[PDB]
Design a protein around this ligand. Sequence first.
Ligand SMILES: CCCCCCCCCCCCCC(=O)O
Ligand code: NA
Length: 285
Amino acid sequence: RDPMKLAVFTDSSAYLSAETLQREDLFVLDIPVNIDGEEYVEGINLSAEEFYQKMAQASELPKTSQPSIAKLDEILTSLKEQGYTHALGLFLSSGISGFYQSIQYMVDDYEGLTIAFPDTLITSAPLGIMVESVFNWRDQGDDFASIQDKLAIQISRTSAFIMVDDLDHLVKGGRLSNGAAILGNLLSIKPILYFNDQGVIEVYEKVRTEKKATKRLIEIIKETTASGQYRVIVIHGNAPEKAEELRQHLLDFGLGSDVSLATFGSVIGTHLGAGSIALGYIPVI
Ligand SMILES: CCCCCCCCCCCCCC(=O)O
Ligand code: NA
């Protein structure tokens, strides 16, 4: 491996594989979720499996907070003092959190520590695979500049396509424009949303029904992944039967172990609400 002494950061909106969660020098900044005046951190005092029902019994909509910039600063200061030479931070999209813009002033603040915080434009399982890939590339002997190049390609060719049971959480949480709600009919319509090339959640297509929207997610992913080898992830929030159906369609298309399943927990589920489904994709670089 390269003789840099590298630290990798992400936040808990990333869906991290068991592989990645074992890796050295990985720092995950937790995102707290306020429910009825109490602060929860998934994996500490909140399990992902209790979240949707807990939210349904809440007296106001839960609210997420940004990853802690104070803890990022303290960790970076510490890593500098312990002789680390490089830090890579892969955080949730600038289009869904002010955290990315807030940390841009820190990049040059730590003498002797080379820092990069590229805008990943994504979250959830694709973000987690970016983190995984960083370690894979390190294991190939890649240095810091080569890792950044490879990340830049992944970022440019990654997105996710999303359908929610109801647009209320997204609009009320602020990550989807207010207009989008009147954009479209009512209960029945199931718009497909995606991460656009600015990392912002945008309406892709207004679909009339859930059954069609399910098919359309598959058809869109067949198109967007046609050039090369991609990881495709079926991601759901309390929608396991729909997720398994989609996974079966992708396996029948031939995706094999390149298709996997993940879940939306408390952080993303606060914004998407229960009953949500997404297909994420990211090239294997
Ligand atoms: C793959 C689909 C992902 C959908 C993401 C919905 C929006 C999540 C925003 C989470 C913000 C957490 C940190 C914050 O509050 O600033
Ligand atoms: Na392909």
